[PDB]
Design a binder for this molecule. Structure first.
Ligand SMILES: COc1ccc(-c2cn(C)c(=O)c3cc(C(=O)NC4CCS(=O)(=O)CC4)sc23)cc1OC
Length: 101
């Protein structure tokens, strides 16, 4: 495990604590939300981010943060402002970036 992998594992653990229901734990399936894959062109979630860390696909912290923002942006485009998914996405986006400093 490289230093970057160790840091991103730490960030990911702390980010996922902000999603206790696990709305962002796995990809949003079309089974869960029919037509999701036809609207959101670049899906992302914490589970995929974990796999990318393990595969050593993040070569910088910036790349990791970009995937986190993508996940949140997707939720804020697919869902209307008055939904639990939008509200949590916005909350954790700001709180997450603050945490990572
Ligand atoms: C059954 O477990 C889940 C239940 C819901 C979700 C989920 C997560 N995220 C991030 C979403 O953006 C999301 C959006 C969902 C949804 O049903 N959207 C519709 C209702 C809200 S809307 O009308 O604004 C857009 C259409 S379900 C869902 C994911 C799940 O597993 C990880």
């Amino acid at each position: 495990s490289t230093p970057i992998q160790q840091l991103l594992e730490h960030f990911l653990r702390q980010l996922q604590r902000k999603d206790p229901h696990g709305f962002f734990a796995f990809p949003v399936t079309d089974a869960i939300a029919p037509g999701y894959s036809m609207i959101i062109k670049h899906p992302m979630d914490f589970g995929t981010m974990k796999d990318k860390i393990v595969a050593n696909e993040y070569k910088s912290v910036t790349e990791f943060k970009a995937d986190f923002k993508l996940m949140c942006d997707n939720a804020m485009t697919y869902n209307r402002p008055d939904t639990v998914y939008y509200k949590l996405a916005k909350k954790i986006l700001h709180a997450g970036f603050k945490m990572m400093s």
